[PDB]
């Protein structure tokens, strides 16, 4: 069993990286991949950099070089669901691009030609993540997570998402891209992220203040999930 | 340009069947591999080793495709071919556009001070390789085609007039064309330090008629971009 884990930023992967035993590092395509064992379980941890293309590049490299059985996307997120506070957990049941528009040719809003309109997360990974949430006593919401190449900061950017995707529970910049690569390679995928801000006009300030907390809570989740999936 | 292996190997990327089909047909001793939803066709085009990839549409599809092409085929350079929406007023359907630079028109991390279109960790724009631009300009002249060289912008939207077009023109007044893949491939190429250029042809002018124009003139754009790419591959490999 080899678990793939992808995060965008140094702050989002640094805690997991430290826990890796027999840590070997691969540097390529502007990405770093840390391989070794996390509490006995073989893992490959990718630091991808930010945005859709960075994530797609990273995911493709991870899949080709390390051949993980599943991928977990971790990190921060902007919370959309009203019951989410900073530090709470979001789990994807589905991912969609909020910034894709080929509606001129009759595709669904968010849907790219040749792709499904959304990417369903793996049911077994979701069930496992829910068990982790219960074990860790955390507040969490499971639902649609939407991705774009924008940091959402209130105003019209936020309103447009809430309008087009009223059931979206969180927004970020990589998950859907990773879900797309995984789809094309038939690899099970789940997003397990923690809230750093609520994507409003103070989101940049909240992000700066609470990125560390979001990394700590998503790390707790991911460490627990790795262990549950090994068994 | 110095070949990495024995001889020069040219990577070519197109999104759509219509954009790659003419080039594919010209490849000698062609072999096909399928992976990650992408098809790669390898062989010789007029004696020059090429690897042609059909990526599918949009930023992620192109990024995944470009990564696979680099990893599996190790090309010395990449040319992105296909159609585009023309923004410069002098462009007509069939005309050529060459990138001197690419930017994302839909990337916005301005809340943290980044330039509009710039993603953190990237330059605000990706400059295309000078040698590839110069060879493309030489081909344009020899074939006596009308062409514009400039900023090409990419995003995950098909531009069709109204506010979508107005926003691009406002944010990128120097942009000469718009499409959905080129900047993604440039970004991948940047990270791997591989020379890149866009050589596309105009299918529409991204206005309220662009869906109708695109459908009628996709074939013409494929034809002219193919003509350019074929000519460029020859120029790159043989002086
Ligand atoms: N409000 C928000 N909008 C979009 N994405 C996010 C996120 C998730 N990610 C965090 C990060 C925000 S952009 C980085 C800003 O820091 C620049 C220093 O590198 C991207 O990888 C997306 C948290 N809040 C968000
Ligand atoms: N007006 C435009 N906006 C964005 N991109 C393009 C392009 C470039 N490509 C053409 C293609 C259009 S989206 C697929 C539409 O399929 C309709 C089937 O004929 C994308 O790969 C981008 C030409 N005109 C454009």
Q: Give yes or no for residue A20 CB within 6 A of ligand 1.
A: no
- Dihedral through CA B51, CA B41, CA A179, CA A127, nearest 10? -130
Tokens of A123: 């049911």
Q: How many other CB atoms are found less than 10 A from the CB of residue A156?
A: 8
How far apart, in whole angstroms, are the C-alpha atoms of residue B152 and residue B104?
9
Domains defined along chain A, listed by start: 1-231 (3.40.50.1580)
* Exposure b/e, A208-224, CB count within 10 A at least 16 = b: eebbeebbebbbbbbbb
Nearest CA to CA, how far is A184 from chain B (Å)? 5
Look at ligand 1, atom 13, and give the residue with the nearest C-alpha.
Answer: A151
> Which chain A residues touch B162 with a CB distance below 8 Å?
none
Is the Cβ–Cβ distance between B94 and B224 less than 8 Å? yes
CB contact under 8 A, B106 and A150: yes
CB contact under 8 A, B211 and A105: yes
Burial of A138 (0-12, 13-18, 19+ CB in 10 A): middle
CA neighbor of B231 nearest in space, from B99, B141, B150? B141
> Which chain B residues touch A30 with a CB distance below 8 Å?
190-192
3-state secondary structure chain A: CEEEEEECCHHHHHHHHHCEEEEEEEEECCEEEEEEEECCEEEEEEECCCCHHHHHHHHHHHHHHHCCCEEEEEEEEEECCCCCCCCCEEEEEEEEECCCECHHHCCCCCCCCCCCCCEECCHHHHHHHHHHHHHCCCCEEEEEEEECCECCCCHHHHHHHHHHCCCEEEEECCHHHHHHHHHHHCCCEEEEEEEEECCCCCHHHHHHHHHHHHHHHHHHHHHHHHHHHHC
> Which ligand is in closest contact with the Cα of B85?
2
3-state secondary structure A51-84: CHHHHHHHHHHHHHHHCCCEEEEEEEEEECCCCC
Only one residue has tokens 């530090």, namely A87
CB contact under 8 A, B111 and A149: no
CA neighbor of A101 nearest in space, from B72, B229, B84, B156? B156
- Name the catalytic one among B129, B181, B204, B230: B204
How far apart, in whole angstroms, are the C-alpha atoms of residue B106 and residue A7?
22
How is residue B204 annotated by DSSP? Answer: E
Ligand 1 mean position, distance from CA A192 (Å)? 15
CB contact under 8 A, B157 and A30: no
Neighbouring residues of A231: CB distance < 8 A, sequence distance ≥ 6: none
Look at ligand 2, atom 5, and give the residue with the nearest C-alpha.
Answer: B179
CB contact under 8 A, A99 and B106: yes
Is the Cβ–Cβ distance between B65 and B55 less than 8 Å? yes
Look at ligand 2, atom 6, and give the residue with the nearest C-alpha.
Answer: B179
* Whole-Å CA distances, B212 to A105, B93, B225: 10, 12, 20
Q: Which of B108, B120, B184 sits opposite A53 (nearest CB)?
A: B184
Q: What is the bridge-based pairing of β-strands B77-86 and B9-14?
A: parallel
Residues of B with CB under 8 A from a CB of A: 36-38, 56-64, 66-68, 70-71, 104, 106-109, 111-112, 119-121, 155-158, 160, 164, 183-184, 187-188, 190-192, 210-211
Strand partners, B152: B102, B177
How far apart, in whole angstroms, are the C-alpha atoms of residue A110 and residue A98?
5
Q: Which of A112, A184, A204 sits opposite B58 (nearest CB)?
A: A112
Q: Give yes or no for residue A8 CB within 6 A of ligand 1.
A: yes
Is the Cβ–Cβ distance between B164 and A110 less than 8 Å? no
Is the Cβ–Cβ distance between A141 and A198 less than 8 Å? no
Look at ligand 1, atom 7, and give the residue with the nearest C-alpha.
Answer: A77
Residue spans of beta strands (DSSP E) within B105-183: 126-127, 147-154, 175-179
Q: How many other CB atoms are found less than 10 A from the CB of residue B207?
A: 16
Rounded to the nearest 10 degrees, what angle do helices A52-66 and B182-192 cross at?
50
CB contact under 8 A, B156 and A64: no
Ligand 1 mean position, distance from CA A151 (Å)? 6
Q: How many other CB atoms are found less than 10 A from the CB of residue B19?
A: 27
- List the resolution, Å: 1.6
Tokens of A189: 């995928």
Name the method of structure determination. Answer: X-ray
What angle (nearest 5°) sits at the alpha carbon of residue A88, between those of residues A85 and A94? Answer: 110
* Whole-Å CA distances, A175 to A72, A73, A196, B148: 10, 7, 16, 36
Q: What is the bridge-based pairing of β-strands B196-204 and B77-86?
A: parallel
Ligand 2 mean position, distance from CA B154 (Å)? 11
3-state secondary structure B42-99: EEEECCEEEEEEECCCCHHHHHHHHHHHHHHHCCCEEEEEEEEEECCCCCCCCCEEEE
Ligand 2-lining residues (CB < 6 angstroms): A 102, 105, 113; B 15-16, 57, 83-85, 158-159, 178-181, 203-204, 206, 210, 214-215
> Which chain A residues touch B211 with a CB distance below 8 Å?
104-105
């Amino acid at each position: 069993m080899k678990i793939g884990i992808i995060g965008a930023m140094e702050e989002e992967v640094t805690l997991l990286r430290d826990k890796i035993d027999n840590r070997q590092t691969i540097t390529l395509g502007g990405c770093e991949i840390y391989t070794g064992q996390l509490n006995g379980t073989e893992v490959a941890l990718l630091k991808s950099g930010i945005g859709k293309v960075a994530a797609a590049l990273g995911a493709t490299l991870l899949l080709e070089h390390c051949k993980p059985d599943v991928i977990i996307n971790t990190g921060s997120a902007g919370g959309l669901a009203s019951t989410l506070k900073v530090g709470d957990i979001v789990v994807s049941d589905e991912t969609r691009y909020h910034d894709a528009d080929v509606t001129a040719f009759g595709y669904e809003y968010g849907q790219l030609p040749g792709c499904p309109a959304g990417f369903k997360a793996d049911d077994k990974l979701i069930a496992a993540a829910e068990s982790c949430i219960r074990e860790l006593n955390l507040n969490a919401v499971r639902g649609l997570i939407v991705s774009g190449d924008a940091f959402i900061n209130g105003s019209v950017g936020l309103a447009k998402i809430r309008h087009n995707f009223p059931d979206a529970v969180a927004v970020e910049m990589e998950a859907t891209a990773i879900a797309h690569v995984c789809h094309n390679f038939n690899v099970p995928f789940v997003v397990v992220r923690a809230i750093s801000d609520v994507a409003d006009q103070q989101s940049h300030l909240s992000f700066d203040e609470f990125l560390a907390v979001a990394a700590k809570q998503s790390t707790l989740m991911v460490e627990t999930l790795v262990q549950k999936l090994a068994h």
